[PDB]
Amino acid sequence: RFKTALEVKKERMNVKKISTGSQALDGLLAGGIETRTMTEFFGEFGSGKTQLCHQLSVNVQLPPEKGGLSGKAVYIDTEGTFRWERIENMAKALGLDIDNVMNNIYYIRAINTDHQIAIVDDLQELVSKDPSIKLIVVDSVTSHFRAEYPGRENLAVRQQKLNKHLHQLTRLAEVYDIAVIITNQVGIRIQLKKSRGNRRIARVVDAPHLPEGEVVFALTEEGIRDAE
């Protein structure tokens, strides 16, 4: 039939969140990763940030009753650490179908700063031609900017470009209703710190709607999960 754009906004405006696989982490996130928002995970190598980028990429495919949005993911690789083998282990843990899972994850390595900005330019067309995409992950988003504008001498210029790039990401998330996650090796900012063994701690460092505080979770062979 013939609708009004107001009906279309009401029918589509509902809060969409994507589970991390850990109930505890979800709690810290008021349910999970949210569309129309950019969420950053930052911390040291192995703190959990990239692993989360792999996990969320599969969970997004899960139906709503299982924590996903029956959507697809784009995984933009900055330092070439993306491993399908991890995606493989995770979709297996959930009993999902591997070839399909892997099939629903667009992937690309951004080789340098200009290619990284170009890719992000191109996503509108991609998410435009394919409405099933509900997740964009940009791992180590600052990597190439730090390597291309090194030192506190170039600090200001670096801040300038990055801010611009990250703005494009926000615009994308809000106009197309997509969840964007960026990670950094160091609206919502989450620090990740190594705890004992495979345990890791997550704490809200910036998020006006999220209660400040931290939680504990684990990096397991099956994926992101609650610590034993």
UniProtKB/Swiss-Prot annotation:
A GO biological process held by the record: DNA repair
Function: Involved in DNA repair and in homologous recombination. Binds and assemble on single-stranded DNA to form a nucleoprotein filament. Hydrolyzes ATP in a ssDNA-dependent manner and promotes DNA strand exchange between homologous DNA molecules.
Residues of the whole record sequence present: 72 to 323 of 324
Family: Belongs to the eukaryotic RecA-like protein family.
Name of the protein in question: DNA repair and recombination protein RadA
Any coiled-coil regions, as ranges: none
UniProt entry keywords in alphabetical sequence: ATP-binding, DNA damage, DNA recombination, DNA-binding, Nucleotide-binding
A molecular function GO annotation: ATP binding
Gene this protein is translated from: radA
